[PDB]
Design a protein around this ligand. Sequence first.
Ligand SMILES: *[C@@H]1O[C@H](CO)[C@@H](O[C@@H]2O[C@H](CO)[C@@H](O)[C@H](O)[C@H]2NC(C)=O)[C@H](O)[C@H]1NC(C)=O
Ligand SMILES: *[C@@H]1O[C@H](CO)[C@@H](O[C@@H]2O[C@H](CO)[C@@H](O)[C@H](O)[C@H]2NC(C)=O)[C@H](O)[C@H]1NC(C)=O
Ligand SMILES: *[C@@H]1O[C@H](CO)[C@@H](O)[C@H](O)[C@H]1NC(C)=O
Ligand SMILES: *[C@@H]1O[C@H](CO)[C@@H](O)[C@H](O)[C@H]1NC(C)=O
Ligand SMILES: *[C@@H]1O[C@H](CO)[C@@H](O)[C@H](O)[C@H]1NC(C)=O
Ligand SMILES: *[C@@H]1O[C@H](CO)[C@@H](O)[C@H](O)[C@H]1NC(C)=O
Ligand SMILES: *[C@@H]1O[C@H](CO)[C@@H](O)[C@H](O)[C@H]1NC(C)=O
Lengths: 49, 49, 316, 195, 49, 288, 167
Amino acid sequence: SVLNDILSRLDPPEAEVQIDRLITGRLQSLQTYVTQQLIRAAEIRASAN
Amino acid sequence: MTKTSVDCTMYICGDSTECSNLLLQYGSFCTQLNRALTGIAVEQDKNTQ
Amino acid sequence: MTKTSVDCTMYICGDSTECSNLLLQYGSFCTQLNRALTGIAVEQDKNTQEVFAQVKQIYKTPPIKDFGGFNFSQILPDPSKPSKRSFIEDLLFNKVTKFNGLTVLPPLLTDEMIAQYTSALLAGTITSGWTFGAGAALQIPFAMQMAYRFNGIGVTQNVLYENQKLIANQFNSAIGKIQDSLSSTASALGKLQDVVNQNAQALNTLVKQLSSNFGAISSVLNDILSRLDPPEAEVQIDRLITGRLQSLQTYVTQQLIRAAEIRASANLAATKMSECVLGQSKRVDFCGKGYHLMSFPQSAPHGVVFLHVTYVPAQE
Amino acid sequence: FNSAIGKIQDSLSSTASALGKLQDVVNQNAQALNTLVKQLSSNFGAISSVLNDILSRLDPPEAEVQIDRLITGRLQSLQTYVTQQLIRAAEIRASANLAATKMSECVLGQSKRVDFCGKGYHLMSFPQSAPHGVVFLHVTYVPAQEKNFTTAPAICHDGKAHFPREGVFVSNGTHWFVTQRNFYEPQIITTDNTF
Amino acid sequence: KLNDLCFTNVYADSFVIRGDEVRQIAPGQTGKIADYNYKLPDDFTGCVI
Amino acid sequence: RSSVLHSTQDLFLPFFSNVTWFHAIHVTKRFDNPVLPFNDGVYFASTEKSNIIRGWIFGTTLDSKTQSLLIVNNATNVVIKVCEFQFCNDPFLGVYYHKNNKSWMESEFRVYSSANNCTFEYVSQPFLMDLEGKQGNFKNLREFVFKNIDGYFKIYSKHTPINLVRDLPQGFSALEPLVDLPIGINITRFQTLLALHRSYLTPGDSSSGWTAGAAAYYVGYLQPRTFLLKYNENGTITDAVDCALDPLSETKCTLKSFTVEKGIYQTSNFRVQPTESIVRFPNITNLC
Amino acid sequence: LVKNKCVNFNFNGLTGTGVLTESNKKFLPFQQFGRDIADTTDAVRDPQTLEILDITPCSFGGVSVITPGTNTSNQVAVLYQGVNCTEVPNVFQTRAGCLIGAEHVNNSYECDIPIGAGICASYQTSQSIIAYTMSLGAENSVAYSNNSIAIPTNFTISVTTEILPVS
Ligand SMILES: *[C@@H]1O[C@H](CO)[C@@H](O[C@@H]2O[C@H](CO)[C@@H](O)[C@H](O)[C@H]2NC(C)=O)[C@H](O)[C@H]1NC(C)=O
Ligand SMILES: *[C@@H]1O[C@H](CO)[C@@H](O[C@@H]2O[C@H](CO)[C@@H](O)[C@H](O)[C@H]2NC(C)=O)[C@H](O)[C@H]1NC(C)=O
Ligand SMILES: *[C@@H]1O[C@H](CO)[C@@H](O)[C@H](O)[C@H]1NC(C)=O
Ligand SMILES: *[C@@H]1O[C@H](CO)[C@@H](O)[C@H](O)[C@H]1NC(C)=O
Ligand SMILES: *[C@@H]1O[C@H](CO)[C@@H](O)[C@H](O)[C@H]1NC(C)=O
Ligand SMILES: *[C@@H]1O[C@H](CO)[C@@H](O)[C@H](O)[C@H]1NC(C)=O
Ligand SMILES: *[C@@H]1O[C@H](CO)[C@@H](O)[C@H](O)[C@H]1NC(C)=O
């Protein structure tokens, strides 16, 4: 689960397959958070108004 | 609500250079997330005003 | 906001048949995104009807135009000019300013038609007061209507008739300033412009996503199809397809959230139209600043601009 | 009023247009939920949708790669349902919130705002429950027949102007009277009527 | 599909090695010859004969 | 499924498709049953009153070198044979009206030479036949659909009781499948058998002695299409609506309902398709 | 080379599909391709021809089927968003799109079905779908005078129903 650890342990030809999965997964976590914030922000905006 | 800004580069790829290049392939997802978040952060100031 | 449509299939798999079959495994994703946008497309048309079509009949102004010293020529429609739009409306329109499977459906209600609805409400308000919202319009002279509106805010009738010359000049003068102000800067029309920019940027961002590799050998779908084996395409195309669906998903999700804000704004507009344009709203600061005598509605590109007449006490 | 109530009862039975909004909400929820169940059958990138079939059919080292695609796709499908649901919830909440205001403004008390409640002036409202909804019957007063009358802003009786108090002047021509705007009644001018 | 596709910057390289050595001349591989004499790129896109 | 509408994409007869009538009726000197090319899924409809029509022969080339399938109908049982059979140019089924015994026996069952090997053999469920040579309108209508996919052979059939007009009837009835076959073999062409109604009036030879009577059958191909099928409470398919037969048909498929409410719906987005293909390359003729 | 007709073209290993038309842009001798704002190929120079030709995609947009109602009739009219009506294979050309199967009429009525861009189509009676420009309401002008007022002589109490979904 650590980029430093995966990068040291594996060489670049094969590092990328492992690093790709982490990046894809993390991107998903971010999008969910960002989407969640917008819905929450919209609720707050209505409340604010 | 508390204004939160997350750097897509720092959270995902991390400090590592290799992660940055792989992230670049995905596109403007890293950038688009920042735009959404600041806008939520900007919105919170407007509400208090 | 301008209707946007994206055939999911066209954007994700492209023209090629292979892209379509691979997308078929995903099932509902392609359709739901296409369907979700349609709901937003239809909803946008619905918003205008609610905000603008609050009058059963289209009223027309009298030829003589004696309104007890109020000059409404600028707000009202000019026959000589094309599209039946008021001078104020014309200024607003001027200030504001398929690529790749993306098509912008035209609005159900045309700009000329909307200008007419606004003209009708405005025409009705001058001639009939607030009575027209409730039932068939009943004509009351403007001075009497003005006097009656003053009574609602707590100032006696005598003040209006005695000071009618003075009150009329201020109204005419006030109208001049708004016109002068609108021409000088785009700050006044900032909110309307913001909606267009946000939608435009999202659309633009979506197009840029196609260029991105998403880990495929090459961004162009045709190049992969042309230079790779049929068995080899199971793997390369799949990364492209997965990425593109995510990009589409982000755009659709973002659009719904943006649509809600506009929907909320439209509801506020409907209330304002109902409460201010027709009738007088005793609520403080709902309409204008200070006691609110009356309101007039002027169409704007993708928006409603409200001119509010309010009474503020000058000296003590 | 009694007759008016009869028509609404008659109107609801004849057509589903009145209850269309409530019906729309149920179909969308049912449809969204149905789609999610339908998604299980779709296989994003694997030999077969059934997990059991994949397990029996393929080897353990190999099976993991295949299962991941099913998991990934299903997880995305579930997320889409949840994300879609929250936005729908938002629409209902805003709509739900409006009902509370209407209930407080209209049912509990008369509301001055024009068109907040019904069309025309709003005397009162009654609340009726519906499956997953609130239906309001609004009693409103709308003027029906009007006659053009000559009018003047003020009457100057003795060199001193007299203005109507809580009324608007109207005249046949022969005589001048003061009357309320909404309904027409004629009263001979008196000290009480004008100041 | 080589006949149908068209390309730029074509390069032709010839070298002779033992059959044990055949495996080494390929993308992302580790061999004495490959890591010390001739190493193909990770993203290399050409036929090996 | 019960009381639900399901859209299934698989080979089907396109609604209102071109139907090719084949005739073997003498009415003069008319008799025809030549070979017909078979595409993916070939639909066969047979209308027979005296059961002159009895058999179907399927093969890549019928060379007795590539496996071929023969279905022969017998009163006792439907016979399915898989075998490298060697067929003549002019196969048939022969029946004679003997004066001594009023019955119809086989005269020359030389449909094939022999069988080198048989990948598969089968006998279909028992059923019975009328075996009557009397003249008349076709009192019954029989339809079978043959399609071969993924190494299996599938036959679906239903029987229509009302003779009505000679041509196939307007009323719509779904068909259940009689059988499926394990045997998997390629197929490029097919042929249909006839019952020669040989009698005393005929010359009395295999080349000129024959008076068959009335026969009629239509052969139609199947192409992949999206079909919306309505299922009733019992589970039979009462009616079907085609996805792409007209603009109205597509709308029904999208809303998944037989009755479409007044409004505007969007389906089947159209993109123009290119008429010709052009390749432009450099004038260089050098051989690298 | 084929010009102004949609075609499949492979130019120097580049594959795309669009109508090809001669374009005025001045390619400086050095550059082979071209691109638009969103980085999509827009122009190319034929190697033999050595001319610059504009590229645009041929058609797009959904086909919308307008139905009066199944009970009322079995016939529908189709509107295509993109088609100019020369491109597509009773045709009426409107801003919303190309419409087939409807005869439009000058007289205007309220919009039963909305075809977009101010044109609406509704069934009329012998029977065919008709597309026409909508009229918002009957145009009536209230008389206004300095001394004229209208006051209602009678009133009607009416009950109106509003439906909202709480949960
Ligand atoms: C479902 O099928 C059954 C037959 O299996 C139908 O029930 C029939 O009901 C009537 C009542 O008098 C009688 O004909 C028999 O009791 C039943 N059938 C027969 C064939 O005799 C039932 O109605 C079917 N449901 C449908 C068509 O919706
Ligand atoms: C006010 O309007 C009411 C309602 O239309 C009128 O009441 C009707 O009068 C007619 C004629 O006298 C009767 O035949 C009906 O039975 C009454 N009821 C209704 C509902 O029509 C009334 O006459 C009108 N004018 C007034 C009171 O001046
Ligand atoms: C009203 O405004 C118009 C336009 O500025 C002007 O022509 C007209 O003279 C103004 N005043 C009056 C009293 O008509
Ligand atoms: C009222 O106003 C005008 C004259 O100003 C006239 O055309 C109309 O007939 C009158 N209507 C009524 C109902 O008295
Ligand atoms: C005006 O009102 C009075 C009411 O007493 C009536 O006598 C008179 O006839 C009316 N004038 C008309 C109808 O001209
Ligand atoms: C498309 O319609 C327009 C109408 O203004 C016309 O000018 C143009 O020539 C048409 N396009 C064709 C024929 O390609
Ligand atoms: C109203 O109209 C009459 C027309 O005779 C006119 O005399 C009068 O001045 C007008 N009233 C005003 C301007 O207040």
